[PDB]
């Protein structure tokens, strides 16, 4: 299992290690929050996380990094 | 007629007393709940401060 902590994902759309699940939505639909939540949720699951931010606003990328740092992620 | 009033009074008092006994018990549960909640709030407050001090130290790092 690769746990997201989202009951809607981990019950009905399960994501497993070695998988590729796409997160698709409209602008401001909550896509980043779902992905970020997943990385924050792997706190003691011993996985490594990479967050590639292609073409994303510099301030926005900084905000994500700050959020990760506060959590200890 | 006699057997009715007595029953009403018997049943009735069994019930007022019972209701107030339940009140007491709750007065007990709430009393318990209040203590637990208070302790939990203190611990939670402790949580916040402790963890934010940790965050500070990490910032210093
Ligand atoms: N489970 C949730 N509960 C409440 N709010 C949420 C949840 N998930 C996301 N949001 C909110 O939705 C807003 C937009 O979310 P987010 O930026 O994560 O989505 P997005 O699709 O990446 O948007 P963008 O296209 O701007 O990148 C955020 O402010 C976030 O707080
Ligand atoms: Mg986004």
């Amino acid at each position: 299992p690769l746990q997201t902590g989202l009951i809607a994902i981990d019950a009905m759309i399960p994501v497993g290690r070695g998988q590729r699940e796409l997160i698709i939505g409209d602008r401001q639909t909550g896509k980043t929050a779902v992905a970020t939540d997943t990385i924050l949720n792997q706190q003691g699951q011993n996985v490594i996380c990479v967050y590639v931010a292609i073409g994303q606003k510099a301030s926005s990328v900084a905000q994500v990094v700050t959020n990760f740092q506060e959590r200890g992620a | 007629t006699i057997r009715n009033s007595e029953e009403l009074r018997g049943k009735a008092i069994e019930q007022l007393e019972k209701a107030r006994a339940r009140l007491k018990k709750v007065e007990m549960d709430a009393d318990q709940f209040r203590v637990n909640g208070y302790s939990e709030i203190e611990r939670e407050k402790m949580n916040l401060i402790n963890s934010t001090y940790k965050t500070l130290e990490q910032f210093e790092n």
Side-chain angles (χ1 to χ4, degrees), chain B residues 14-59:
Chain B
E14 152 152 35
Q15 186 173 355
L16 188 147
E17 293 177 350
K18 299 296 183 181
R20 181 177 65 83
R22 181 177 181 170
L23 62 80
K24 183 178 179 180
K25 183 178 179 180
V26 175
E27 216 184 313
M28 183 66 75
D29 186 347
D31 281 341
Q32 185 64 60
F33 159 58
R34 181 179 180 274
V35 153
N36 192 31
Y38 207 103
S39 295
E40 295 302 320
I41 186 167
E42 183 178 2
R43 181 177 65 83
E44 293 177 350
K45 183 178 179 180
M46 292 177 72
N47 192 31
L48 177 63
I49 61 171
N50 289 337
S51 64
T52 299
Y53 176 77
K54 183 68 180 295
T55 189
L56 177 63
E57 214 158 53
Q58 186 173 355
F59 177 80

mmCIF file of all heavy atoms in Angstrom, chain B residues 14-59:
data_model
loop_
_atom_site.group_PDB
_atom_site.id
_atom_site.type_symbol
_atom_site.label_atom_id
_atom_site.label_comp_id
_atom_site.label_asym_id
_atom_site.label_seq_id
_atom_site.Cartn_x
_atom_site.Cartn_y
_atom_site.Cartn_z
ATOM 1 N N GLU B 14 -41.153 5.600 41.353
ATOM 2 C CA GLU B 14 -40.041 4.788 40.881
ATOM 3 C C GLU B 14 -39.394 5.520 39.718
ATOM 4 O O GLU B 14 -38.187 5.721 39.693
ATOM 5 C CB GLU B 14 -40.525 3.415 40.430
ATOM 6 C CG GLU B 14 -39.661 2.785 39.351
ATOM 7 C CD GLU B 14 -39.697 1.272 39.388
ATOM 8 O OE1 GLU B 14 -40.769 0.711 39.702
ATOM 9 O OE2 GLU B 14 -38.654 0.646 39.108
ATOM 10 N N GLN B 15 -40.226 5.930 38.768
ATOM 11 C CA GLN B 15 -39.785 6.661 37.601
ATOM 12 C C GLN B 15 -38.980 7.871 38.022
ATOM 13 O O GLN B 15 -37.863 8.062 37.554
ATOM 14 C CB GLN B 15 -40.986 7.116 36.773
ATOM 15 C CG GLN B 15 -40.607 7.765 35.459
ATOM 16 C CD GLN B 15 -41.818 8.047 34.596
ATOM 17 O OE1 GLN B 15 -42.940 7.674 34.940
ATOM 18 N NE2 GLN B 15 -41.598 8.706 33.464
ATOM 19 N N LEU B 16 -39.958 9.512 39.208
ATOM 20 C CA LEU B 16 -39.252 10.722 39.611
ATOM 21 C C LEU B 16 -37.885 10.411 40.201
ATOM 22 O O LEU B 16 -36.867 10.971 39.784
ATOM 23 C CB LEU B 16 -40.076 11.528 40.608
ATOM 24 C CG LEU B 16 -39.512 12.909 40.947
ATOM 25 C CD1 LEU B 16 -40.643 13.888 41.217
ATOM 26 C CD2 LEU B 16 -38.564 12.831 42.133
ATOM 27 N N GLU B 17 -37.862 9.497 41.162
ATOM 28 C CA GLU B 17 -36.612 9.135 41.806
ATOM 29 C C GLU B 17 -35.599 8.638 40.791
ATOM 30 O O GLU B 17 -34.458 9.063 40.798
ATOM 31 C CB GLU B 17 -36.836 8.084 42.891
ATOM 32 C CG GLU B 17 -37.634 8.605 44.076
ATOM 33 C CD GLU B 17 -37.908 7.527 45.107
ATOM 34 O OE1 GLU B 17 -37.643 6.341 44.813
ATOM 35 O OE2 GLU B 17 -38.387 7.865 46.210
ATOM 36 N N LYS B 18 -36.028 7.748 39.906
ATOM 37 C CA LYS B 18 -35.134 7.193 38.904
ATOM 38 C C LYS B 18 -34.569 8.286 38.016
ATOM 39 O O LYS B 18 -33.377 8.308 37.732
ATOM 40 C CB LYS B 18 -35.857 6.147 38.059
ATOM 41 C CG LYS B 18 -36.370 4.965 38.857
ATOM 42 C CD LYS B 18 -35.223 4.186 39.470
ATOM 43 C CE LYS B 18 -35.729 2.960 40.209
ATOM 44 N NZ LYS B 18 -34.617 2.197 40.839
ATOM 45 N N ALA B 19 -35.429 9.190 37.581
ATOM 46 C CA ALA B 19 -34.999 10.280 36.728
ATOM 47 C C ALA B 19 -33.943 11.115 37.430
ATOM 48 O O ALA B 19 -32.906 11.430 36.848
ATOM 49 C CB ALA B 19 -36.184 11.143 36.327
ATOM 50 N N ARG B 20 -34.183 11.453 38.695
ATOM 51 C CA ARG B 20 -33.214 12.274 39.424
ATOM 52 C C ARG B 20 -31.917 11.531 39.758
ATOM 53 O O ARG B 20 -30.850 12.134 39.865
ATOM 54 C CB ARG B 20 -33.851 12.925 40.651
ATOM 55 C CG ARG B 20 -32.866 13.801 41.406
ATOM 56 C CD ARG B 20 -33.559 14.488 42.577
ATOM 57 N NE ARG B 20 -34.021 13.546 43.594
ATOM 58 C CZ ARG B 20 -33.250 13.050 44.557
ATOM 59 N NH1 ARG B 20 -31.975 13.405 44.640
ATOM 60 N NH2 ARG B 20 -33.753 12.199 45.443
ATOM 61 N N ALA B 21 -32.010 10.208 39.876
ATOM 62 C CA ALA B 21 -30.860 9.356 40.144
ATOM 63 C C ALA B 21 -29.999 9.390 38.893
ATOM 64 O O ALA B 21 -28.773 9.491 38.962
ATOM 65 C CB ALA B 21 -31.307 7.938 40.449
ATOM 66 N N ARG B 22 -30.662 9.341 37.736
ATOM 67 C CA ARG B 22 -29.993 9.426 36.450
ATOM 68 C C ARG B 22 -29.336 10.794 36.339
ATOM 69 O O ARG B 22 -28.223 10.901 35.851
ATOM 70 C CB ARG B 22 -30.985 9.237 35.309
ATOM 71 C CG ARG B 22 -30.339 9.292 33.936
ATOM 72 C CD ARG B 22 -31.351 9.024 32.839
ATOM 73 N NE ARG B 22 -30.726 9.054 31.522
ATOM 74 C CZ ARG B 22 -31.327 8.668 30.401
ATOM 75 N NH1 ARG B 22 -32.576 8.225 30.432
ATOM 76 N NH2 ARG B 22 -30.677 8.727 29.246
ATOM 77 N N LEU B 23 -30.027 11.842 36.789
ATOM 78 C CA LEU B 23 -29.468 13.184 36.779
ATOM 79 C C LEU B 23 -28.155 13.167 37.557
ATOM 80 O O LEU B 23 -27.128 13.641 37.071
ATOM 81 C CB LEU B 23 -30.448 14.175 37.410
ATOM 82 C CG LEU B 23 -30.832 13.980 38.875
ATOM 83 C CD1 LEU B 23 -29.758 14.520 39.804
ATOM 84 C CD2 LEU B 23 -32.182 14.614 39.167
ATOM 85 N N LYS B 24 -28.191 12.610 38.767
ATOM 86 C CA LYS B 24 -27.000 12.511 39.597
ATOM 87 C C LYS B 24 -25.874 11.807 38.853
ATOM 88 O O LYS B 24 -24.754 12.308 38.791
ATOM 89 C CB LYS B 24 -27.305 11.753 40.887
ATOM 90 C CG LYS B 24 -26.127 11.672 41.843
ATOM 91 C CD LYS B 24 -26.504 10.949 43.125
ATOM 92 C CE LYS B 24 -25.316 10.847 44.072
ATOM 93 N NZ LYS B 24 -25.661 10.143 45.338
ATOM 94 N N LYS B 25 -26.182 10.644 38.285
ATOM 95 C CA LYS B 25 -25.186 9.869 37.552
ATOM 96 C C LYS B 25 -24.551 10.712 36.453
ATOM 97 O O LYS B 25 -23.331 10.758 36.322
ATOM 98 C CB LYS B 25 -25.812 8.604 36.966
ATOM 99 C CG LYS B 25 -24.826 7.702 36.248
ATOM 100 C CD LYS B 25 -25.513 6.446 35.737
ATOM 101 C CE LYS B 25 -24.540 5.549 34.996
ATOM 102 N NZ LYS B 25 -25.206 4.315 34.492
ATOM 103 N N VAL B 26 -25.388 11.375 35.664
ATOM 104 C CA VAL B 26 -24.903 12.235 34.601
ATOM 105 C C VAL B 26 -24.069 13.297 35.285
ATOM 106 O O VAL B 26 -22.912 13.522 34.929
ATOM 107 C CB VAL B 26 -26.053 12.880 33.806
ATOM 108 C CG1 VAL B 26 -25.516 13.868 32.782
ATOM 109 C CG2 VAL B 26 -26.885 11.801 33.130
ATOM 110 N N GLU B 27 -24.652 13.945 36.282
ATOM 111 C CA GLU B 27 -23.912 14.944 36.996
ATOM 112 C C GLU B 27 -22.570 14.294 37.237
ATOM 113 O O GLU B 27 -21.555 14.980 37.370
ATOM 114 C CB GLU B 27 -24.592 15.257 38.324
ATOM 115 C CG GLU B 27 -24.518 16.716 38.744
ATOM 116 C CD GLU B 27 -25.120 16.953 40.114
ATOM 117 O OE1 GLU B 27 -26.236 16.456 40.372
ATOM 118 O OE2 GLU B 27 -24.474 17.632 40.940
ATOM 119 N N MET B 28 -22.552 12.962 37.278
ATOM 120 C CA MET B 28 -21.286 12.292 37.503
ATOM 121 C C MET B 28 -20.520 12.191 36.188
ATOM 122 O O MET B 28 -19.343 12.546 36.124
ATOM 123 C CB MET B 28 -21.525 10.899 38.093
ATOM 124 C CG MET B 28 -20.261 10.128 38.439
ATOM 125 S SD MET B 28 -19.347 10.905 39.777
ATOM 126 C CE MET B 28 -20.369 10.452 41.174
ATOM 127 N N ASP B 29 -21.187 11.729 35.133
ATOM 128 C CA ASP B 29 -20.512 11.593 33.847
ATOM 129 C C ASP B 29 -19.948 12.925 33.376
ATOM 130 O O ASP B 29 -18.786 13.002 32.981
ATOM 131 C CB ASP B 29 -21.440 11.009 32.784
ATOM 132 C CG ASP B 29 -20.719 10.729 31.483
ATOM 133 O OD1 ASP B 29 -19.575 11.203 31.323
ATOM 134 O OD2 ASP B 29 -21.291 10.037 30.617
ATOM 135 N N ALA B 30 -20.765 13.971 33.424
ATOM 136 C CA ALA B 30 -20.323 15.293 32.998
ATOM 137 C C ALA B 30 -19.102 15.699 33.805
ATOM 138 O O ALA B 30 -18.089 16.123 33.247
ATOM 139 C CB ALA B 30 -21.436 16.308 33.168
ATOM 140 N N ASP B 31 -19.222 15.561 35.122
ATOM 141 C CA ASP B 31 -18.167 15.867 36.068
ATOM 142 C C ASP B 31 -16.901 15.161 35.631
ATOM 143 O O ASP B 31 -15.797 15.580 35.981
ATOM 144 C CB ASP B 31 -18.566 15.437 37.478
ATOM 145 C CG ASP B 31 -19.508 16.424 38.136
ATOM 146 O OD1 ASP B 31 -19.561 17.584 37.679
ATOM 147 O OD2 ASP B 31 -20.203 16.035 39.098
ATOM 148 N N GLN B 32 -17.060 13.916 35.188
ATOM 149 C CA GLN B 32 -15.924 13.120 34.715
ATOM 150 C C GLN B 32 -15.390 13.656 33.405
ATOM 151 O O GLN B 32 -14.184 13.824 33.196
ATOM 152 C CB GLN B 32 -16.323 11.655 34.551
ATOM 153 C CG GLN B 32 -15.157 10.761 34.181
ATOM 154 C CD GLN B 32 -14.111 10.715 35.274
ATOM 155 O OE1 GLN B 32 -14.399 10.311 36.399
ATOM 156 N NE2 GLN B 32 -12.889 11.120 34.949
ATOM 157 N N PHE B 33 -16.342 13.969 32.537
ATOM 158 C CA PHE B 33 -16.054 14.475 31.218
ATOM 159 C C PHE B 33 -15.355 15.796 31.330
ATOM 160 O O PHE B 33 -14.388 16.027 30.636
ATOM 161 C CB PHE B 33 -17.346 14.635 30.428
ATOM 162 C CG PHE B 33 -17.244 15.586 29.278
ATOM 163 C CD1 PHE B 33 -16.320 15.379 28.277
ATOM 164 C CD2 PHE B 33 -18.086 16.681 29.192
ATOM 165 C CE1 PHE B 33 -16.229 16.251 27.210
ATOM 166 C CE2 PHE B 33 -18.004 17.558 28.130
ATOM 167 C CZ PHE B 33 -17.072 17.341 27.137
ATOM 168 N N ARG B 34 -15.803 16.652 32.238
ATOM 169 C CA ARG B 34 -15.160 17.943 32.374
ATOM 170 C C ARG B 34 -13.707 17.759 32.779
ATOM 171 O O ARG B 34 -12.821 18.371 32.187
ATOM 172 C CB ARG B 34 -15.897 18.815 33.393
ATOM 173 C CG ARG B 34 -15.300 20.201 33.580
ATOM 174 C CD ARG B 34 -16.073 21.043 34.579
ATOM 175 N NE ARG B 34 -15.466 22.361 34.725
ATOM 176 C CZ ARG B 34 -14.468 22.627 35.559
ATOM 177 N NH1 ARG B 34 -13.980 21.669 36.332
ATOM 178 N NH2 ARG B 34 -13.961 23.849 35.626
ATOM 179 N N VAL B 35 -13.438 16.865 33.725
ATOM 180 C CA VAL B 35 -12.062 16.670 34.150
ATOM 181 C C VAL B 35 -11.204 16.157 33.001
ATOM 182 O O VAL B 35 -10.104 16.671 32.741
ATOM 183 C CB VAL B 35 -11.976 15.661 35.303
ATOM 184 C CG1 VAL B 35 -10.621 14.975 35.305
ATOM 185 C CG2 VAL B 35 -12.237 16.358 36.628
ATOM 186 N N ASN B 36 -11.738 15.192 32.260
ATOM 187 C CA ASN B 36 -10.963 14.639 31.164
ATOM 188 C C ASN B 36 -10.678 15.694 30.121
ATOM 189 O O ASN B 36 -9.563 15.819 29.644
ATOM 190 C CB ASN B 36 -11.697 13.476 30.519
ATOM 191 C CG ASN B 36 -10.814 12.696 29.579
ATOM 192 O OD1 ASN B 36 -9.604 12.604 29.778
ATOM 193 N ND2 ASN B 36 -11.418 12.128 28.543
ATOM 194 N N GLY B 37 -11.685 16.495 29.809
ATOM 195 C CA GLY B 37 -11.536 17.522 28.807
ATOM 196 C C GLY B 37 -10.507 18.532 29.236
ATOM 197 O O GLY B 37 -9.680 18.936 28.443
ATOM 198 N N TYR B 38 -10.533 18.913 30.505
ATOM 199 C CA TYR B 38 -9.596 19.895 31.009
ATOM 200 C C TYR B 38 -8.177 19.362 30.869
ATOM 201 O O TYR B 38 -7.279 20.051 30.359
ATOM 202 C CB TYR B 38 -9.906 20.147 32.481
ATOM 203 C CG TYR B 38 -9.519 21.509 33.001
ATOM 204 C CD1 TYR B 38 -10.476 22.491 33.202
ATOM 205 C CD2 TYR B 38 -8.204 21.803 33.320
ATOM 206 C CE1 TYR B 38 -10.129 23.735 33.692
ATOM 207 C CE2 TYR B 38 -7.847 23.043 33.809
ATOM 208 C CZ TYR B 38 -8.814 24.006 33.993
ATOM 209 O OH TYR B 38 -8.463 25.242 34.480
ATOM 210 N N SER B 39 -7.984 18.102 31.247
ATOM 211 C CA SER B 39 -6.650 17.526 31.156
ATOM 212 C C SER B 39 -6.181 17.459 29.708
ATOM 213 O O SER B 39 -5.032 17.768 29.392
ATOM 214 C CB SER B 39 -6.610 16.147 31.808
ATOM 215 O OG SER B 39 -6.856 16.247 33.199
ATOM 216 N N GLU B 40 -7.095 17.080 28.826
ATOM 217 C CA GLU B 40 -6.775 16.966 27.417
ATOM 218 C C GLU B 40 -6.395 18.317 26.864
ATOM 219 O O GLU B 40 -5.446 18.425 26.118
ATOM 220 C CB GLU B 40 -7.962 16.407 26.638
ATOM 221 C CG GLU B 40 -8.327 14.982 27.010
ATOM 222 C CD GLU B 40 -7.174 14.020 26.814
ATOM 223 O OE1 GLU B 40 -6.451 14.158 25.807
ATOM 224 O OE2 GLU B 40 -6.991 13.129 27.666
ATOM 225 N N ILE B 41 -7.122 19.357 27.249
ATOM 226 C CA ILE B 41 -6.826 20.692 26.763
ATOM 227 C C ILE B 41 -5.444 21.104 27.239
ATOM 228 O O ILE B 41 -4.661 21.634 26.463
ATOM 229 C CB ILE B 41 -7.879 21.730 27.212
ATOM 230 C CG1 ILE B 41 -7.605 23.085 26.556
ATOM 231 C CG2 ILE B 41 -7.877 21.886 28.723
ATOM 232 C CD1 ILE B 41 -8.746 24.070 26.684
ATOM 233 N N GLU B 42 -5.113 20.813 28.494
ATOM 234 C CA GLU B 42 -3.792 21.196 28.971
ATOM 235 C C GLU B 42 -2.710 20.478 28.173
ATOM 236 O O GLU B 42 -1.730 21.091 27.728
ATOM 237 C CB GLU B 42 -3.645 20.870 30.456
ATOM 238 C CG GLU B 42 -2.318 21.303 31.054
ATOM 239 C CD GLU B 42 -2.229 21.007 32.539
ATOM 240 O OE1 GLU B 42 -3.189 20.426 33.089
ATOM 241 O OE2 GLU B 42 -1.200 21.350 33.156
ATOM 242 N N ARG B 43 -2.917 19.187 27.931
ATOM 243 C CA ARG B 43 -1.930 18.418 27.189
ATOM 244 C C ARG B 43 -1.781 18.945 25.774
ATOM 245 O O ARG B 43 -0.679 19.023 25.250
ATOM 246 C CB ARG B 43 -2.295 16.936 27.159
ATOM 247 C CG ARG B 43 -1.283 16.084 26.415
ATOM 248 C CD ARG B 43 -1.641 14.609 26.468
ATOM 249 N NE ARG B 43 -2.886 14.313 25.770
ATOM 250 C CZ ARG B 43 -2.989 14.123 24.459
ATOM 251 N NH1 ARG B 43 -1.918 14.196 23.683
ATOM 252 N NH2 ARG B 43 -4.168 13.860 23.918
ATOM 253 N N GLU B 44 -2.905 19.292 25.158
ATOM 254 C CA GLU B 44 -2.931 19.810 23.800
ATOM 255 C C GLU B 44 -2.201 21.133 23.723
ATOM 256 O O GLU B 44 -1.493 21.398 22.760
ATOM 257 C CB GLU B 44 -4.366 19.942 23.302
ATOM 258 C CG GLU B 44 -5.073 18.607 23.122
ATOM 259 C CD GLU B 44 -6.523 18.753 22.694
ATOM 260 O OE1 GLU B 44 -7.046 19.884 22.716
ATOM 261 O OE2 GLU B 44 -7.141 17.736 22.323
ATOM 262 N N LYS B 45 -2.378 21.967 24.743
ATOM 263 C CA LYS B 45 -1.702 23.254 24.808
ATOM 264 C C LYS B 45 -0.199 23.020 24.891
ATOM 265 O O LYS B 45 0.584 23.686 24.209
ATOM 266 C CB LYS B 45 -2.184 24.058 26.012
ATOM 267 C CG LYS B 45 -1.574 25.444 26.104
ATOM 268 C CD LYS B 45 -2.133 26.205 27.293
ATOM 269 C CE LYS B 45 -1.508 27.584 27.406
ATOM 270 N NZ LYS B 45 -2.049 28.341 28.570
ATOM 271 N N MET B 46 0.159 22.063 25.740
ATOM 272 C CA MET B 46 1.515 21.562 25.884
ATOM 273 C C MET B 46 2.049 21.062 24.557
ATOM 274 O O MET B 46 3.211 21.281 24.219
ATOM 275 C CB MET B 46 1.519 20.417 26.895
ATOM 276 C CG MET B 46 1.218 20.839 28.331
ATOM 277 S SD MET B 46 1.133 19.495 29.535
ATOM 278 C CE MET B 46 2.860 19.043 29.667
ATOM 279 N N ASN B 47 1.193 20.371 23.815
ATOM 280 C CA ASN B 47 1.561 19.853 22.513
ATOM 281 C C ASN B 47 2.043 20.999 21.651
ATOM 282 O O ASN B 47 3.181 20.994 21.183
ATOM 283 C CB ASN B 47 0.370 19.169 21.852
ATOM 284 C CG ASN B 47 0.765 18.366 20.633
ATOM 285 O OD1 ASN B 47 1.869 17.834 20.559
ATOM 286 N ND2 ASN B 47 -0.139 18.276 19.667
ATOM 287 N N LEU B 48 1.173 21.989 21.479
ATOM 288 C CA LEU B 48 1.447 23.134 20.621
ATOM 289 C C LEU B 48 2.772 23.782 20.971
ATOM 290 O O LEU B 48 3.670 23.841 20.137
ATOM 291 C CB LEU B 48 0.318 24.161 20.715
ATOM 292 C CG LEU B 48 0.522 25.446 19.912
ATOM 293 C CD1 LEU B 48 0.596 25.145 18.424
ATOM 294 C CD2 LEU B 48 -0.572 26.458 20.205
ATOM 295 N N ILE B 49 2.906 24.225 22.217
ATOM 296 C CA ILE B 49 4.127 24.890 22.652
ATOM 297 C C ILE B 49 5.357 24.028 22.401
ATOM 298 O O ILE B 49 6.324 24.502 21.808
ATOM 299 C CB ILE B 49 4.067 25.328 24.130
ATOM 300 C CG1 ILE B 49 3.885 24.117 25.046
ATOM 301 C CG2 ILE B 49 2.962 26.344 24.352
ATOM 302 C CD1 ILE B 49 4.032 24.439 26.515
ATOM 303 N N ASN B 50 5.308 22.761 22.810
ATOM 304 C CA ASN B 50 6.478 21.894 22.690
ATOM 305 C C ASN B 50 6.899 21.789 21.229
ATOM 306 O O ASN B 50 8.075 21.965 20.875
ATOM 307 C CB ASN B 50 6.180 20.506 23.255
ATOM 308 C CG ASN B 50 6.060 20.504 24.766
ATOM 309 O OD1 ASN B 50 6.588 21.385 25.442
ATOM 310 N ND2 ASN B 50 5.355 19.514 25.303
ATOM 311 N N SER B 51 5.917 21.556 20.369
ATOM 312 C CA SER B 51 6.221 21.284 18.981
ATOM 313 C C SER B 51 6.701 22.547 18.296
ATOM 314 O O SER B 51 7.548 22.488 17.419
ATOM 315 C CB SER B 51 5.009 20.699 18.263
ATOM 316 O OG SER B 51 3.958 21.647 18.233
ATOM 317 N N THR B 52 6.173 23.692 18.707
ATOM 318 C CA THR B 52 6.580 24.944 18.097
ATOM 319 C C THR B 52 7.974 25.326 18.561
ATOM 320 O O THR B 52 8.718 25.951 17.825
ATOM 321 C CB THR B 52 5.588 26.085 18.381
ATOM 322 O OG1 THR B 52 4.307 25.743 17.836
ATOM 323 C CG2 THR B 52 6.065 27.386 17.748
ATOM 324 N N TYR B 53 8.338 24.933 19.774
ATOM 325 C CA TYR B 53 9.706 25.128 20.232
ATOM 326 C C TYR B 53 10.641 24.249 19.403
ATOM 327 O O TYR B 53 11.718 24.692 18.969
ATOM 328 C CB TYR B 53 9.823 24.899 21.750
ATOM 329 C CG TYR B 53 11.216 24.978 22.343
ATOM 330 C CD1 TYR B 53 11.834 26.200 22.565
ATOM 331 C CD2 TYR B 53 11.906 23.827 22.686
ATOM 332 C CE1 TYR B 53 13.105 26.268 23.105
ATOM 333 C CE2 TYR B 53 13.175 23.886 23.225
ATOM 334 C CZ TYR B 53 13.769 25.108 23.433
ATOM 335 O OH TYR B 53 15.032 25.164 23.974
ATOM 336 N N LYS B 54 10.198 23.026 19.109
ATOM 337 C CA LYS B 54 10.945 22.179 18.189
ATOM 338 C C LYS B 54 11.104 22.845 16.822
ATOM 339 O O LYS B 54 12.186 22.817 16.238
ATOM 340 C CB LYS B 54 10.281 20.815 18.042
ATOM 341 C CG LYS B 54 11.051 19.861 17.151
ATOM 342 C CD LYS B 54 12.364 19.455 17.798
ATOM 343 C CE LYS B 54 13.149 18.498 16.915
ATOM 344 N NZ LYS B 54 12.450 17.196 16.734
ATOM 345 N N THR B 55 10.033 23.455 16.321
ATOM 346 C CA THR B 55 10.075 24.112 15.027
ATOM 347 C C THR B 55 11.047 25.267 15.060
ATOM 348 O O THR B 55 11.778 25.474 14.113
ATOM 349 C CB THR B 55 8.699 24.635 14.590
ATOM 350 O OG1 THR B 55 8.768 25.077 13.232
ATOM 351 C CG2 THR B 55 8.280 25.803 15.465
ATOM 352 N N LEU B 56 11.047 26.021 16.152
ATOM 353 C CA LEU B 56 12.000 27.100 16.339
ATOM 354 C C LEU B 56 13.401 26.557 16.167
ATOM 355 O O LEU B 56 14.172 27.058 15.340
ATOM 356 C CB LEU B 56 11.853 27.715 17.729
ATOM 357 C CG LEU B 56 12.854 28.818 18.071
ATOM 358 C CD1 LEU B 56 12.693 30.018 17.149
ATOM 359 C CD2 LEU B 56 12.719 29.235 19.529
ATOM 360 N N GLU B 57 13.721 25.501 16.907
ATOM 361 C CA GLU B 57 15.084 24.991 16.966
ATOM 362 C C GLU B 57 15.526 24.539 15.586
ATOM 363 O O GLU B 57 16.671 24.744 15.194
ATOM 364 C CB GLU B 57 15.189 23.838 17.958
ATOM 365 C CG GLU B 57 16.522 23.769 18.685
ATOM 366 C CD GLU B 57 16.439 23.003 19.994
ATOM 367 O OE1 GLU B 57 15.962 21.847 19.982
ATOM 368 O OE2 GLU B 57 16.850 23.555 21.036
ATOM 369 N N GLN B 58 14.609 23.927 14.850
ATOM 370 C CA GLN B 58 14.866 23.538 13.470
ATOM 371 C C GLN B 58 15.148 24.751 12.586
ATOM 372 O O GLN B 58 16.004 24.704 11.706
ATOM 373 C CB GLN B 58 13.686 22.744 12.916
ATOM 374 C CG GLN B 58 13.928 22.174 11.532
ATOM 375 C CD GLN B 58 12.813 21.256 11.083
ATOM 376 O OE1 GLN B 58 11.888 20.963 11.843
ATOM 377 N NE2 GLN B 58 12.894 20.791 9.841
ATOM 378 N N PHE B 59 14.422 25.838 12.826
ATOM 379 C CA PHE B 59 14.653 27.101 12.136
ATOM 380 C C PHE B 59 16.052 27.630 12.428
ATOM 381 O O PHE B 59 16.727 28.156 11.546
ATOM 382 C CB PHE B 59 13.628 28.133 12.610
ATOM 383 C CG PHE B 59 13.813 29.500 12.015
ATOM 384 C CD1 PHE B 59 13.363 29.787 10.739
ATOM 385 C CD2 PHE B 59 14.438 30.503 12.743
ATOM 386 C CE1 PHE B 59 13.534 31.049 10.200
ATOM 387 C CE2 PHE B 59 14.612 31.766 12.209
ATOM 388 C CZ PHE B 59 14.159 32.039 10.934
#
